[PDB]
């Protein structure tokens, strides 16, 4: 309701954090019982769907603004088969799985990259530049991942260094996803840097293209803009 | 009441499991629904509010606190278990205890990864944090290899050590039956292991070390222990004081 | 099955998955070691036979299989084994050695007696030259000397394939006395033999390695295999899981939903 | 030239390397097998292997055993059971070992022990020559 | 070879003693490494 104000009234893209829908659904469901309502399979409130639905349907892009809904999602039963998330998926179109591990690699930000996904990535909407580059990347990351598996166990020149190169490119790309931080600048030092899309698409593409590969990788580490990566690249090449 | 009387009280709610049953029963007997998993819904609410009534209060409340250590004694790691799932969404972490260690004689019991302090460190002594930081890690890497080819199969040396280290720390992570500690004792022994001093020992003897070592510092290095309690923390000196004490003492402990 | 069953299964499979996986690297490491060990070695064994070749020979007069005491690694040993005792009828005098013991299977059931030796601790701390000599020396003492031995081992091709080998054991110091060996203008049935001898270790080491390297590398392979299987299953079980769970949940939820209530 | 294969499980030093000469303790004496030498097969004997590499250099070695195999051709393969570079071989030890060796010889049992001792002595000398 | 071949002593026996004698010899850093190639997982059976 508030967000409807900001959307419509304030014409905005309201960001709606709903944290967590799991708790929501659950909250409804808690009542379901008491309400003598028949809940559902898996216990869910019967209304699980409507509950979600109308609500999701109440979120959108009006032609005033958007209520862009970013929903923090505690995962019920850590599956999605738990009907709601599956349903949620119906309403999910950009999906965030954060990689605790990547973060643990000191990478900041450090999502699960391949499961930083969107059904809405397109060579159309987001165009092929994005798409493809990404497809190349996503793939690449994986490819790098693939090689990781080999090398990991077998020490090295277990690769040919084009694989290494891609591995490296990927690393840079990887690192470029790391971005210095503003909010936790108090901790980190540096600042939250913001990356206009073209620099992004371009950015990785370049790294991918190896056009930058003759430079180090921490360059990309803690960078927003591909320039800020390039600049740091140079800088790491002292 | 304590909380509002400043006081930081510790409640151990022992156990909500038992409650749950009763309560569930209560609903049912009241004919009233239970809920999900056949047991009440807002027994979560019951607790949610119950446990929300535990808090760390500001200063106005005399810093008010109730530290709540709620307890559930599990059947079959049923965490999946309704209330546990619930609870899982509620606490500030959960302390997973592991039997295997117990039968092994190992006390603590714990499965650590399962154990969590979401909170982690902020309430932690720097003293400990400083030695412990390092330990958590030493175990962490250790743990993957703690899992790896555990049997009589080699490892690379790095890892032969980590394993040793890990193992040592395990002993260290034992704690006797009805044998509480204090942070310095702990930090001390942690320091001991961290700084590797007892990898040296083959594992059985750790326990002997620790006690002996403890009774030793208890004799002398209350100087230090007291100090460490005081500084709350290790200074480079305290470290240095430790360093010798342990090394030599350790040397004495051994030979 | 009931979730237990699934778990039970799972439990193990996961374990396996680890165990095998564990064994995979463990092996890979061994294997890796062995891999290292091949360089001078390579030469060394290659060397070892490297002359009954130029100056050549053939008998008209010790069979041996040289591989592992290993299985779980695979059926490598069986491979040589096979191809070993399978032969033996033609030969001469019959004196066979299986060094390697999972090789001693296809041979070990026809004799226990026409074995001369076996090596144990095949691989392990990766097997080596000394040993090759060690095992070489006493071996000599025996009554079959080139009733032409064969040495059967898995000569590696790759960490995953080796080809179950034989090579022939020139223990001629005889027909090798005869021929184009004169050309080795002097040489003595000493020094001859005392190279034959010497090459017995060289090779021995080598063969041993060829096999063992193969085996160990095979062990990774086996251990892989297992995990591929695992991996899937593990996945699948996880369904079986949900289901039995849900089946459950639901079913109760039934009972709950007056499947025991209003409608008791 | 002889593609001299100079080896030990330890090492292949010259790996068919186009060497001019290797001086080799064969069992009676030696010979400095020169660049491509006739076939002759000789079983070594400890001495030092001195690999007069074609190059001008000679690299020094100690050899204990194996066979060098002098093919007709250019391939000469010293496959010394033990082939070492002197670097790794301690004169001091050799001597001391020799001290011992000589000591031991006296109680060495039979030609075989004696031999052994001697092998060792000879050896110790045989490093010692160079070493 | 008379100081070993006398009666018996293989070229191996000999050699190995030679080699052994190398093993016996060697400088230090270097000295670890010897036994590595020796009869070690030498465990001879006929089984």
From Swiss-Prot, chain B:
Record-listed Mg(2+) binding positions: 14
Binding site for ATP: 175, 177
Sequence positions bearing N6-succinyllysine: 7, 129, 200, 208, 233, 241
Post-translational modification note: Acetylated on lysine residues. BLOC1S1 is required for acetylation.
Subcellular location: Mitochondrion inner membrane; Cell membrane
Expression across tissues: Heart muscle (at protein level). Heart and liver.
Residues with PTM N6-acetyllysine: 7, 129, 136, 200, 208, 233, 241, 243
Site feature location: Required for activity: 115
Family note: Belongs to the ATPase alpha/beta chains family.
Additional observations: The siderophore enterobactin (Ent) produced by enteric bacteria binds Fe(3+) and helps bacteria scavenge iron ions from the environment. As a consequence, the mammalian siderocalin LCN2 plays an important role in defense against bacterial infections by sequestering iron bound to microbial siderophores. LCN2 can also bind iron bound to endogenous or nutrient-derived iron chelators and plays an important role in cellular iron homeostasis.
Subunit structure: Homotrimer. Component of the ATP synthase complex composed at least of ATP5F1A/subunit alpha, ATP5F1B/subunit beta, ATP5MC1/subunit c (homooctomer), MT-ATP6/subunit a, MT-ATP8/subunit 8, ATP5ME/subunit e, ATP5MF/subunit f, ATP5MG/subunit g, ATP5MK/subunit k, ATP5MJ/subunit j, ATP5F1C/subunit gamma, ATP5F1D/subunit delta, ATP5F1E/subunit epsilon, ATP5PF/subunit F6, ATP5PB/subunit b, ATP5PD/subunit d, ATP5PO/subunit OSCP.
Protein name per its UniProtKB record: ATP synthase F(1) complex subunit alpha, mitochondrial
Organism expressing this protein natively: Bos taurus (Bovine)
Parent-record interval covered: 299 to 553 of 553
UniProtKB/Swiss-Prot annotation, chain C:
Any one Gene Ontology BP term: proton motive force-driven ATP synthesis
Annotated Gene3D superfamilies: 3.40.1380.10, ATP synthase, gamma subunit, helix hairpin domain
Membrane-topology annotation of the record: Peripheral membrane protein
PROSITE patterns: ATPASE_GAMMA
Subcellular location: Mitochondrion inner membrane
Residues annotated with Phosphoserine modification: 112
Domain of life: Eukaryota
Key words, A-Z: Acetylation, ATP synthesis, CF(1), Hydrogen ion transport, Ion transport, Membrane, Mitochondrion, Mitochondrion inner membrane, Phosphoprotein, Transit peptide, Transport
Keyword Ion transport: yes
Entry's Gene Ontology cellular component terms: mitochondrial inner membrane; mitochondrion; proton-transporting ATP synthase complex
GO molecular function per UniProt: proton-transporting ATP synthase activity, rotational mechanism
Protein name: ATP synthase F(1) complex subunit gamma, mitochondrial
Name of the encoding gene: ATP5F1C
UniProtKB/Swiss-Prot annotation, chain D:
Residue numbers carrying N6-acetyllysine: 100, 129
Keyword RNA-binding: no
GO CC terms, sorted: mitochondrial envelope; mitochondrial inner membrane; mitochondrion; proton-transporting ATP synthase complex
Predominant place of localization: mitochondrion
GO molecular function: proton transmembrane transporter activity; proton-transporting ATP synthase activity, rotational mechanism; structural molecule activity
Location relative to the cell: Mitochondrion; Mitochondrion inner membrane
Keywords of the record: Acetylation, ATP synthesis, CF(1), Hydrogen ion transport, Ion transport, Membrane, Mitochondrion, Mitochondrion inner membrane, Transit peptide, Transport
One of the GO biological process terms: proton motive force-driven ATP synthesis
N6-succinyllysine modified-residue sites: 100, 129
Summary of subunit composition and partner proteins: Component of the ATP synthase complex composed at least of ATP5F1A/subunit alpha, ATP5F1B/subunit beta, ATP5MC1/subunit c (homooctomer), MT-ATP6/subunit a, MT-ATP8/subunit 8, ATP5ME/subunit e, ATP5MF/subunit f, ATP5MG/subunit g, ATP5MK/subunit k, ATP5MJ/subunit j, ATP5F1C/subunit gamma, ATP5F1D/subunit delta, ATP5F1E/subunit epsilon, ATP5PF/subunit F6, ATP5PB/subunit b, ATP5PD/subunit d, ATP5PO/subunit OSCP.
Family of this protein: Belongs to the ATPase epsilon chain family.
UniProt-recorded name of the protein: ATP synthase F(1) complex subunit delta, mitochondrial
Protein's organism: Bos taurus (Bovine)
Part of the intact protein present: 37 to 167 of 168
UniProtKB/Swiss-Prot annotation, chain E:
In-chain residues carrying the UniProt-annotated modification N6-acetyllysine: 20, 31, 36, 43
Domain of life of the source: Eukaryota
UniProt keyword annotation of Isomerase present: no
One Gene Ontology MF term: proton-transporting ATP synthase activity, rotational mechanism
A Pfam family: ATP-synt_Eps
SUPFAM superfamilies to which the protein is assigned, alphabetical: Epsilon subunit of mitochondrial F1F0-ATP synthase
Any single biological process term in GO: proton motive force-driven mitochondrial ATP synthesis
Transmembrane segment boundaries: none
Subcellular location: Mitochondrion; Mitochondrion inner membrane
Keyword Membrane: yes
Main location, first listed in the record: mitochondrion
Entries under InterPro entries matching the protein: ATP_synth_F1_esu_mt, ATP_synth_F1_esu_sf_mt
Protein task: Subunit epsilon, of the mitochondrial membrane ATP synthase complex (F(1)F(0) ATP synthase or Complex V) that produces ATP from ADP in the presence of a proton gradient across the membrane which is generated by electron transport complexes of the respiratory chain. ATP synthase complex consist of a soluble F(1) head domain - the catalytic core - and a membrane F(1) domain - the membrane proton channel. These two domains are linked by a central stalk rotating inside the F(1) region and a stationary peripheral stalk.
Subunit structure: Component of the ATP synthase complex composed at least of ATP5F1A/subunit alpha, ATP5F1B/subunit beta, ATP5MC1/subunit c (homooctomer), MT-ATP6/subunit a, MT-ATP8/subunit 8, ATP5ME/subunit e, ATP5MF/subunit f, ATP5MG/subunit g, ATP5MK/subunit k, ATP5MJ/subunit j, ATP5F1C/subunit gamma, ATP5F1D/subunit delta, ATP5F1E/subunit epsilon, ATP5PF/subunit F6, ATP5PB/subunit b, ATP5PD/subunit d, ATP5PO/subunit OSCP.
């Amino acid at each position: 309701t508030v967000a409807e104000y900001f959307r419509d009234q304030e014409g905005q893209d309201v960001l709606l954090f709903i944290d967590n829908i799991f708790r929501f659904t659950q909250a409804g469901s808690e009542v379901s019982a008491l309400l003598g309502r028949i809940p559902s399979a898996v216990g869910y409130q019967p209304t699980l769907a409507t509950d979600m639905g109308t609500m999701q349907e109440r979120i959108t892009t009006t032609k005033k603004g958007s209520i862009t809904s970013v929903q923090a999602i505690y995962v019920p039963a850590d599956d999605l088969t738990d009907p709601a998330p599956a349903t949620t998926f119906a309403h999910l179109d950009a999906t965030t799985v954060l990689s605790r591990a990547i973060a643990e690699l000191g990478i900041y930000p450090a999502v699960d990259p391949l499961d930083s996904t969107s059904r809405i990535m397109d060579p159309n909407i987001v165009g092929s530049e994005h798409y493809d580059v990404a497809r190349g990347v996503q793939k690449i990351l994986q490819d790098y991942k693939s090689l990781q598996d080999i090398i990991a166990i077998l020490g090295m020149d277990e690769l040919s260094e084009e694989d290494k190169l891609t591995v490296s490119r990927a690393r840079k790309i990887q690192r470029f996803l790391s971005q210095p931080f503003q909010v936790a600048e108090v901790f980190t030092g540096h600042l939250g840097k913001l990356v206009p899309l073209k620099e992004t698409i371009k950015g990785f593409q370049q790294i991918l293209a190896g056009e930058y590969d003759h430079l180090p990788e921490q360059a990309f580490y803690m960078v927003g803009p591909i320039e800020e990566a390039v600049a740091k690249a140079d800088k790491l090449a002292e | 009441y304590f909380r509002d009387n400043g006081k930081h009280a510790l409640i151990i709610y022992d156990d909500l499991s038992k409650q749950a049953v009763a309560y569930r029963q209560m609903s049912l007997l009241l004919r009233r629904p239970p809920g999900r998993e056949a047991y009440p819904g807002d027994v979560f609410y019951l607790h949610s509010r119950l446990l929300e009534r535990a808090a760390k209060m500001n200063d106005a409340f005399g810093g008010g606190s109730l530290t709540a250590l709620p307890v559930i004694e599990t059947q079959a790691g049923d965490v999946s278990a309704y209330i546990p799932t619930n609870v899982i969404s509620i606490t500030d972490g959960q302390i997973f205890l592991e039997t295997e260690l117990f039968y092994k004689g190992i006390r603590p019991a714990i499965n650590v990864g399962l154990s969590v302090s979401r909170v982690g460190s902020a309430a932690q002594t720097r003293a400990m944090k400083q030695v412990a930081g390092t330990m958590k890690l030493e175990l962490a890497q250790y743990r993957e290899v703690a899992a790896f080819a555990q049997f009589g199969s080699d490892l690379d040396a790095a890892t032969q050590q980590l394993l040793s280290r890990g193992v040592r720390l395990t002993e260290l992570l034992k704690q006797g039956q009805y044998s509480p500690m204090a942070i310095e004792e702990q930090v001390a022994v942690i320091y001991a292991g961290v700084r590797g001093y007892l990898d040296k020992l083959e594992p059985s003897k750790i326990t002997k070390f620790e006690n002996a070592f403890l009774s030793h510092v208890i004799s002398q290095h209350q100087a230090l222990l007291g100090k460490i309690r005081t500084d709350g923390k290790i200074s480079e000196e305290s470290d240095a004081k430790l360093k010798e004490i342990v090394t030599n003492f350790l040397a004495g402990f051994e030979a | 099955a009931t979730l237990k069953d699934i778990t039970r299964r799972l439990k193990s499979i996961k374990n396996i998955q680890k165990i095998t996986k564990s064994m995979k690297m463990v092996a890979a490491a061994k294997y890796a070691r062995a891999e290292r060990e091949l360089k001078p070695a390579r030469v060394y064994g290659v060397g070892s036979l490297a002359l009954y070749e130029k100056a050549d020979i053939k008998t008209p007069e010790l069979i041996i299989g040289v591989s592992s005491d290993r299985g779980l690694c695979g059926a490598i040993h069986s491979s040589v084994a096979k191809q070993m005792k399978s032969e033996a009828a033609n030969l001469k005098e019959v004196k066979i050695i299986g060094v390697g013991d999972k090789i001693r299977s296809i041979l070990h059931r026809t004799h226990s007696d026409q074995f001369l030796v076996t090596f144990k601790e095949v691989g392990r701390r990766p097997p080596t030259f000394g040993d090759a000599s060690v095992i070489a020396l006493e071996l000599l003492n025996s009554g079959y000397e080139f009733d032409e031995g064969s040495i059967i081992f898995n000569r590696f091709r790759s960490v995953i394939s080796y080809k179950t080998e034989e090579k022939p054991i020139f223990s001629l110091d005889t027909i090798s006395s005869a021929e184009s060996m004169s050309i080795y203008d002097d040489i003595d049935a000493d020094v001859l033999r005392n190279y034959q001898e010497y090459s017995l270790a060289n090779i021995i080491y080598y063969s041993l390695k060829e096999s063992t390297t193969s085996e160990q590398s095979a062990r990774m392979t086996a251990m892989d295999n297992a995990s591929k299987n695992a991996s899937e299953m593990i996945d699948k079980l996880t369904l079986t899981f949900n289901r039995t769970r849900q089946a459950v949940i639901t079913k109760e939820l039934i009972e709950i939903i007056s499947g025991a209530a209003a409608l008791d | 030239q002889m593609s001299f294969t100079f080896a030990s499980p330890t090492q292949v030093f010259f790996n068919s390397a186009n060497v001019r000469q290797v001086d080799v303790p064969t069992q009676t004496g030696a010979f400095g097998i020169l660049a491509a030498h006739v076939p002759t097969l000789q079983v070594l004997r400890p001495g030092l292997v001195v690999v007069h590499a074609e190059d001008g250099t000679t690299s020094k070695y100690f050899v204990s055993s194996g066979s060098v195999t002098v093919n007709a051709d250019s391939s000469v393969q010293l496959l010394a059971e033990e082939a070492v570079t002197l670097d790794m071989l301690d004169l001091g030890a050799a001597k001391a070992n020799l001290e011992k060796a000589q000591s031991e010889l006296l109680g060495a049992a039979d030609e075989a022990t004696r031999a052994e001792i001697q092998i060792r002595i000879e050896a110790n000398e045989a490093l010692v020559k160079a070493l | 070879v008379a100081y070993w071949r006398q009666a018996g002593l293989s070229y191996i026996r000999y050699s190995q003693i030679c080699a052994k004698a190398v093993r016996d010899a060697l400088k230090t850093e270097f000295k670890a490494n010897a036994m590595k190639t020796s009869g070690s997982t030498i465990k001879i059976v006929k089984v």
